[PDB]
Amino acid sequence: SYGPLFEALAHYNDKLLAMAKAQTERTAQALLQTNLDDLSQQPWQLIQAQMNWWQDQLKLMQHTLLKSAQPIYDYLKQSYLLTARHLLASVDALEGVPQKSRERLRFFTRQYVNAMAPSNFLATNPELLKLTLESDGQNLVRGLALLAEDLERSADQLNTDESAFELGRDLALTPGRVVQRTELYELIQYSPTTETVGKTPVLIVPPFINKYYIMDMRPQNSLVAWLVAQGQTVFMISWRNPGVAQAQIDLDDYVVDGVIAALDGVEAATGEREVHGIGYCIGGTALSLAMGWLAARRQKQRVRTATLFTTLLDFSQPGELGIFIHEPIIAALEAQNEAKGIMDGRQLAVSFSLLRENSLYWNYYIDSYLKGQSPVAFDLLHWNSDSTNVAGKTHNSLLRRLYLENQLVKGELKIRNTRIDLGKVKTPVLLVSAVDDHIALWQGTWQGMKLFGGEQRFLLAESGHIAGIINPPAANKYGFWHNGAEAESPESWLAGATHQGGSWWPEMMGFIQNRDGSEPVPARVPEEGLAPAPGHYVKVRLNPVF
Amino acid sequence: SYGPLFEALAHYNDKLLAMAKAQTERTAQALLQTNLDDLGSQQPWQLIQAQMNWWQDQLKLMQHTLLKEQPIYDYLKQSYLLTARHLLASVDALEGVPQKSRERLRFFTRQYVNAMAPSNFLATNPELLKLDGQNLVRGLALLAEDLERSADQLNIFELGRDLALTPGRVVQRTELYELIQYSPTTETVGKTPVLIVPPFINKYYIMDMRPQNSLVAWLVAQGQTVFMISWRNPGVAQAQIDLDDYVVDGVIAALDGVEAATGEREVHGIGYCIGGTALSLAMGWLAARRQKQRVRTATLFTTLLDFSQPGELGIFIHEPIIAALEAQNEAKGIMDGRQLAVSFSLLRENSLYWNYYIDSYLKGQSPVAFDLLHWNSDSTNVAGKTHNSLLRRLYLENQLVKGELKIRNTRIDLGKVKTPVLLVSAVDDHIALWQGTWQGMKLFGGEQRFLLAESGHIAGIINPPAANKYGFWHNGAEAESPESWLAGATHQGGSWWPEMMGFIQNREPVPARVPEEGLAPAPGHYVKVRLNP
Amino acid sequence: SYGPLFEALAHYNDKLLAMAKAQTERTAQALLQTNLQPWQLIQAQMNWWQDQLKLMQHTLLSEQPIYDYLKQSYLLTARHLLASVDALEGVPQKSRERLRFFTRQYVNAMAPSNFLATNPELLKLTLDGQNLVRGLALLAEDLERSADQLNITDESAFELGRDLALTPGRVVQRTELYELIQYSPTTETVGKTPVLIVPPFINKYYIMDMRPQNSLVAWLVAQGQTVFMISWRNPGVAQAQIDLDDYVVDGVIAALDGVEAATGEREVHGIGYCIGGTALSLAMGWLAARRQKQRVRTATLFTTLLDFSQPGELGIFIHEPIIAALEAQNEAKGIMDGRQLAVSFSLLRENSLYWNYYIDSYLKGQSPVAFDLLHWNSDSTNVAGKTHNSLLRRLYLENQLVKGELKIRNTRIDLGKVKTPVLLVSAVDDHIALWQGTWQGMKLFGGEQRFLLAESGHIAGIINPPAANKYGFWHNGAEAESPESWLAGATHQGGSWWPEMMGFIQNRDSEPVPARVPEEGLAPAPGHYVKVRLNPVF
């Protein structure tokens, strides 16, 4: 029963043989472009050393599992020889590599290795599971505090700087201008790449947990740059990394002084009172709460369409994050957040990982390398560790009002003393979720869809929270499921769904356009504004780099 | 006659818009400073805009109705809408201001409200003005009691930090005064030092308020070694101190103290109000006894030597009342400063709200009016026998204009003083009427000069060249009638301090005198003794 | 000219002092009996009125004399602010926000420029076809956005059914256009003929059911009368085609059928207010034109307009280009927004709401009536688009009812065919329905006619319960040829005209019938339609 695995390894071994042919021809051609006066990528042999381990360990496992029907040690001895062969071949393959690149790979390998160990994160820590296993009361807080301060202190002492990525050069490099800056955000308007653009502009509301540039990573996988290339004027909210000065900022402020203020900022830049809204994770929650706020107060509609990525409105199924949703734990965090003023992102980093794609190594290290790309896994790892703080009041509200009491579903949620009913929102909504998502379980995102009072569409994408959402059409990598019909259950919806391979981005673009008709307007060249894109807020790091 | 008032309000409203634009750009710039570990014009500009809205709308309404149910009830109602709008706009402008900060504005506003009410002061109370032997003396006391207790209920800034912060040293401490020598701010200073004799009816630090409006700091910056007498707040232990003591043991003793610190027997004299009078009697005392002259120049701010025009203080100067106070002062030991603060106010500028609260705020300063009200309410006692001497020997009998006054059994005669004398008075002065001070100049026997400031008792005196806020009248000719010197007087504008500086300068440089260690840092301890802790 | 003013001030100061002493003796006697807005606030305002009037006397007796008065008036304003917040020390924060909100409402309501009808600039623009419309649009949007932030703002606004419109009853019918309320008897025996009340569809009805001390519904009920009330739905865009005709037939007349269903009586006593009185008049006209048996025994009409030739201050809108523009907007949106009508005119403009319904109301121990009136006036309702066009064009502009050209569902209306006795009750200071114009409409009727003129304005003169003993009215049973002649022959009476209305209704008589208890309806009174707000409350 090893056929499909040897087939996958054989497929990669042939793609690697072709690349070695390319590098050999590349090194020879570089010798031609030489002058007498003058004084990055990893070697294919480094990947070949890893490919040989996977093949030899599988062969040894198959050989000793047919021999099964001494025995434990002999397999161990042969597997240690494979590890030793792997150490020698890797060190050899990095012979001509400059020391700086070696420390880069040593850095990114250590991130990957630490991230794939469940004990390194509180949400998947087995010892913390024992405490929650109906074992105790308030010591749970102390037991949780010991694990957190130990996981943190381990990451403190681990915390290389120079060998990193620079925002605006390597990531988040879509041309544009910062056209408005307030306490909570920097509003970026991106430069056009088309002669004509749509009249109704696009406003992207990112999550305030982690930074926005997951949606503008590199030109090949940038949602922002793809949207601009589809003739859309694209605006991005770039949240401030909050400090102690932002301690009293609440979820209500992000809705009103954030999304709503950004909508007004779009009107100042374009003259349009209505925008197409796109929201990701807690930003998708903030976008929905902004629509409910406007509708409850009978304000004129300002969102023509709304696409929500991995957005939780019903928190009944919190996933692994449910381990923290217990009154003693929530109360203890509320005390810390009031005293410290913020929830440290570096503490949130040891609590849970927003990046747990099941195939980060194979699809975004090995596959991206063989596609001629700088490993996308390095970029993803940089983003997951570019932690943001969370304002203490906002984090308390997220913990209690949404995760614990589920106020939005129950109709008890109030934003600036205005009760929020999503049934009054008539904006058409498209919810795009991911089947392997571990932060916003796709069944729970489905449940929130019925809360809206207008047109409702749902798309289920293959893969997880990041990989499934940030899937550019040119990649041709995954698929999605579409069902226009209404259903009584998440499972019934899937049963009636149809599967399509590739990116779901064109479906979102179809959803946005079919609504608009409105004539294409001349391309909007962004005003000079306050600063070039990306802003200053996105570069503020919790562990500063030099 | 509505033109210049709408223009002045337009001038102020335009200055408030520019300050508001400066604050919005400063908050916008503060966003670029985004340190994650530290937290990022105390009055809001909206609060001042609410005041300016009231002034403009009431002036609009009152021009509108003066052009023509009852037409008067209509004006009464509409102005009440403006008062209500002003109340609502003020409370809304103070929403983000801290509660402890809001308790401040309620404090000083109440002071200004009570300080411009004539009924709250005896000298300007209509009921007292309508007065008869015992009935007057018993009544004045009864009225004094009603005003003092009302002030007390209302009564329920730090010296050296917010006010009186010029660096210096206390070089000598006697029973009556602390002598302050200030540190130099220039590499070179004049040889002859400067000694300032402040009034002892109020504390000294009106002449040293803030760096922008401190006379002491300006004089040091002009290359002068400046000394300052700091009168002690007299308690009951000082019940038998006199003007004579303040002259000899207060002023002349300080002259010997100044020589001990510099080696100079001659100083440039500067006197303020009753401090200028005490200096004048001191100068005659040296002249009447034929001692070598120890005062080079004498600048006298609002100095009263002829008391024929007492002003509103006249109601107090009657023979039955003086005797009443003479018996009470000796019985109680001293005259209570809290009662003297109730008697009258030194804070009666015609533009205290406009030039020292609004103009101060628009210049970026913390409101100067707040500091003046803190100083006026920081009253100091006056010794029982000094006060009795001032009421009878000077205010009533007027012994200085005649030859009957004596300082420690020594007949005075200002005609024997040959020192150049400069009088700086105020047109709106209500304590020292400028005609009386000008007449009292003629008692001197040396060169004389008279300068008239454009404002009241303290605003026309505390006017630095950097303010460029007021003006002054001068006239080089000699005139014999009050309307004759002023009719021929010419208006210059700006501060008269450079003109007072020139008078001292016209009559070789010495390395800057660094004050010795002395007894304590300036400000001294006497200035901090408050009647109400 | 200051004497009456000073005397009135001391007149008010005496009650405050008298009421202030009653509070010290009540709290002193409260020390003995134990087991187990501040007056100071009103006194601060009283001091400002007296001190300012004293100042104006002195000043009336160059740049300095002017500035000296202007300075002095500012010290009075500072004293007012200082004393006012001082009196509000121990008052709870929840009530202070209510005082601070209703005060803000009053100041804006007293600025003539805040309403289009009294707007100075619009009068200049009117005195210019497309230009007038575009200019009027500029003031309309400027005033609507300026009223956004100020109106929207707290939960201290009263709750219907608890503080206002709390007269017990049951909602016995619910149609698209209205909910029918039948109230509880409170008396052993009621009159055989029931009373039906038709309120205006512009603004809500609770103005007649404010509080038990001034509720017309509660007073009518206590007078042994079965009282019905029509609670108009706040129309949304789904009601865009509802016309004036539908409010007459599917409104008043359908409600007449509802009254018969719940009592068995085909004949009712009619009471109408403002455009409700117009609809009631048109319903009687419709019934008479089709020769149906009389269903309205008596009709009393409060400040109702049948002749629109004297539109008062509202006539600034009655011009061909303005009405044409409004019709286009009403057809586009489907609805005339009540938030836009809020800044167009005020239905509430008493001469002294502050003196008669805040100061006086406080002196009588009541919660300030000026607050309840302002809450009602701010409780705007939309108007169905076709209905508003009909009101603007067919009545205000063309005046079809007087000329006999008005058609209600293809039925020409002639009020001369109506033989129901009519009692028109108008207000001398009314600014919406000028009383002389209401007198001209009286003659249109073909039966008995009576006219009563009340002393106050549009609201205060009408809602004057007999227990207040506050105003008077003029009655004259003889016919006259002009409003001026009718008033010259009138006789003034002090007090409320409500008993005279009940004399009018009851003197037609019959035998008292046993009190009709409402059946368990769809909902308790007041229903759901009256709670629908244009700006939702928190």
Every domain of chain B and the residues it spans: 1-17+44-97, 168-310+413-528
Burial of A479 (0-12, 13-18, 19+ CB in 10 A): middle
**Helices and strands, counts by H and E, chain B:** 19, 15
**Beta strand spans in C191-326 (E):** 195-198, 227-232, 268-273, 296-302
Q: Alpha carbon A135 to chain centroid distance? A: 34
Which residues on C lie below 8 Å from A417 (Cβ)? 155, 538
Distance CA A517, CA C75 (A): 64
Specify the long-range contacts of residues C519-522, CB closer than 8 Å, at least 24 apart.
C519/C170, C519/C172, C519/C262, C520/C170, C521/C170, C521/C171, C521/C172, C521/C173, C521/C182, C522/C171, C522/C172, C522/C173, C522/C174, C522/C179
Nearest Cα of chain C lies from the Cα of A185 at a distance, in angstroms, of 24
Residue C59 is inside which H or E element, if any?
A: helix C39-60
Alpha helices in B306-421 (DSSP H): 319-332, 337-343, 352-353, 359-362, 368-377, 384-389
Distance CA A257, CA A247 (A): 15
| Nearest partner of A140 among A324, A344, A400, judged by Cα | A324
B156 near A CB under 8 A:
no
Which residues on C lie below 8 Å from B55 (Cβ)? 70, 74
Nearest Cα of chain C lies from the Cα of A418 at a distance, in angstroms, of 6
User: How big is chain A by its Cα radius of gyration, in Å?
Assistant: 25
**Residue pair A302/A263 in contact by the 8 Å Cβ criterion:** yes
Crossing angle, helix B3-30 and helix C63-87, to 10 degrees?
50
Nearest Cα of chain B lies from the Cα of C302 at a distance, in angstroms, of 26
**C155·A417 Cβ contact <8 A:** yes
**Residue pair C169/C183 in contact by the 8 Å Cβ criterion:** yes
CB atoms within 10 A of CB B342: 24
**B36·A183 Cβ contact <8 A:** no
**Residue pair B242/B382 in contact by the 8 Å Cβ criterion:** no
**B112·C56 Cβ contact <8 A:** no
Which residues on C lie below 8 Å from A416 (Cβ)? none
Distance CA A56, CA A337 (A): 51
C170 pairs with which residues across the strands? C182, C524
DSSP character at residue B203 = -
A180 near B CB under 8 A:
no
B36 near A CB under 8 A:
yes
**Residue pair B434/B426 in contact by the 8 Å Cβ criterion:** yes
**Residue pair C279/C272 in contact by the 8 Å Cβ criterion:** yes
A418 near C CB under 8 A:
yes
**Beta strand spans in A332-485 (E):** 342-343, 390-391, 414-415, 418-419, 429-434, 456-461, 479-482
Nearest 5°: phi and psi at C341? Answer: -65, -25
**C80·B62 Cβ contact <8 A:** no
Distance CA C299, CA C277 (A): 9
The catalytic site residues of B sit at: 273
Q: Which two tokens stand for residue B496?
A: 């008269």
Which residues on C lie below 8 Å from A419 (Cβ)? 538
SS3 call for A307: strand
**Residue pair B362/B12 in contact by the 8 Å Cβ criterion:** yes
**C534·A298 Cβ contact <8 A:** yes
For residue C152, the number of C-alpha atoms closer than 13 Å in the C-beta half-sphere is: 19
A414 pairs with which residues across the strands? A419
Residue B268's identity, in one-letter code, is: H
CA-based angle A139:A142:A148, to the nearest 5? 140
Q: Which two tokens stand for residue A97?
A: 């590599």
Which residues on A lie below 8 Å from B38 (Cβ)? 243-245
Specify the long-range contacts of residues B147-151, CB closer than 8 Å, at least 24 apart.
B147/B120, B147/B121, B147/B122, B147/B342, B148/B338, B148/B339, B148/B342, B150/B120, B151/B114, B151/B120, B151/B338, B151/B341, B151/B342
Distance CA B438, CA B305 (A): 9
A419 pairs with which residues across the strands? A414
Out of A236, A281, A323, A380, the active site residue is: A281
Distance CA A449, CA A308 (A): 10
Q: Alpha carbon C7 to chain centroid distance? A: 31
Architecture of domain B168-310+413-528: 3-Layer(aba) Sandwich (3.40)
B32 near A CB under 8 A:
yes
Alpha helices in A94-196 (DSSP H): 99-115, 126-132, 139-158
Nearest Cα of chain A lies from the Cα of B28 at a distance, in angstroms, of 8
Distance CA B435, CA B484 (A): 11
**B37·A243 Cβ contact <8 A:** yes
DSSP character at residue B527 = G
Q: What approach was used to elucidate this structure?
A: X-ray
Nearest Cα of chain A lies from the Cα of C154 at a distance, in angstroms, of 9
Which residues on A lie below 8 Å from C152 (Cβ)? 297
- Please tell me which residue of chain C has the smallest CA distance to B70: C1
CA-based angle C361:C362:C367, to the nearest 5? 80
Distance CA A330, CA C94 (A): 31
Q: Which two tokens stand for residue B145?
A: 């009691």
The residues near A273 (Cβ < 8 Å, ≥ 6 apart) are A267, A300, A302
**A244·B40 Cβ contact <8 A:** no
The residues near B4 (Cβ < 8 Å, ≥ 6 apart) are C63
Which residues on B lie below 8 Å from C79 (Cβ)? 113
B533 near C CB under 8 A:
no
**B37·A181 Cβ contact <8 A:** no
Would you tell me which CATH number, out of the four given (3.40.50.300, 3.30.420.10, 2.30.110.10, 3.40.50.1820), belongs to the domain C169-315+401-531? 3.40.50.1820
Nearest Cα of chain A lies from the Cα of C152 at a distance, in angstroms, of 9
Nearest 5°: phi and psi at C33? Answer: -95, 85
**C70·B84 Cβ contact <8 A:** no
Chain C contact partners (≥3 CB pairs within 8 A): A, B
Distance CA B133, CA B143 (A): 16
Distance CA C371, CA C352 (A): 13
Which residues on B lie below 8 Å from C103 (Cβ)? 84, 88
C501: left (phi over 0), alpha (psi -120 to 50) or beta: alpha
**A297·C152 Cβ contact <8 A:** yes
Alpha helices in C88-173 (DSSP H): 93-109, 120-126, 130-151
Residue A33's identity, in one-letter code, is: Q
Q: Alpha carbon B71 to chain centroid distance? A: 44
**Residue pair C518/C473 in contact by the 8 Å Cβ criterion:** no
B37 near A CB under 8 A:
yes
**Residue pair A379/A171 in contact by the 8 Å Cβ criterion:** yes
For chain B, the maximum distance between any two Cα atoms, rounded to a whole number of angstroms, is 80
- Count of pairs with CB atoms under 8 A, one residue in B, one in C: 78
Residue B172's identity, in one-letter code, is: Q
The residues near A146 (Cβ < 8 Å, ≥ 6 apart) are none
Q: Which two tokens stand for residue C249?
A: 């037939």
| Nearest partner of C241 among C341, C330, C325, judged by Cα | C330
B31 near A CB under 8 A:
yes
Residue C260's identity, in one-letter code, is: E
DSSP character at residue C80 = H
Residue A235 is inside which H or E element, if any?
A: strand A234-239
3-state secondary structure A20-46: HHHHHHHHHHHHHCCCCCCCCCCCHHH
Which residues on B lie below 8 Å from C52 (Cβ)? 76, 79-80
Resolution, Å (one decimal): 2.7
CB atoms within 10 A of CB A354: 20
- Count of pairs with CB atoms under 8 A, one residue in A, one in C: 11
**Residue pair C345/C316 in contact by the 8 Å Cβ criterion:** no
Q: Which two tokens stand for residue C436?
A: 């002389």
B426: left (phi over 0), alpha (psi -120 to 50) or beta: beta
Q: Measure CB to CB from residue C52 to each of B2, B55, B76 and give the nearest one.
A: B76
The residues near B413 (Cβ < 8 Å, ≥ 6 apart) are B284, B287, B288, B403
Distance CA A62, CA A58 (A): 6
From chain B residues 337-376, the ones with a CB under 8 A of any chain C CB are 353
From chain C residues 86-125, the ones with a CB under 8 A of any chain B CB are 100, 103-104, 106-107, 110-111
Distance CA A255, CA A285 (A): 9
B85 near C CB under 8 A:
yes
- The single residue listed with the structure tokens 């999503």 is A422
The catalytic site residues of C sit at: 274
3-state secondary structure B434-468: HHHHHHHHCCCCCCEEEEEECCCCCCCCCCCCCCC
- Most B CBs within 10 A among A244, A246, A388, A389, hence the mutation to make, goes to A244
Beta-strand relationship, C296-302 and C268-273: parallel
**Residue pair A524/A492 in contact by the 8 Å Cβ criterion:** no
**A419·C538 Cβ contact <8 A:** yes
DSSP character at residue C233 = -
A297 near C CB under 8 A:
yes
Q: Alpha carbon B78 to chain centroid distance? A: 39
3-state secondary structure B15-69: HHHHHHHHHHHHHHHHCCCCCCCCCCCCCCHHHHHHHHHHHHHHHHHHHHHCCCC
The residues near C369 (Cβ < 8 Å, ≥ 6 apart) are C210, C211, C214, C357, C358, C361
Nearest 5°: phi and psi at B335? Answer: -95, 125
Distance CA B275, CA B231 (A): 10
Nearest 5°: phi and psi at A521? Answer: -100, 160
Distance CA A478, CA A500 (A): 9
Does the domain at A176-322+413-539 match CATH 3.40.50.1820? Answer given as: yes
- Please tell me which residue of chain B has the smallest CA distance to C50: B76
Distance CA B215, CA C340 (A): 62
A182 near B CB under 8 A:
yes
Nearest 5°: phi and psi at C239? Answer: -100, 30
| Nearest partner of C304 among C145, C512, C106, C445, judged by Cα | C445
DSSP character at residue A324 = G
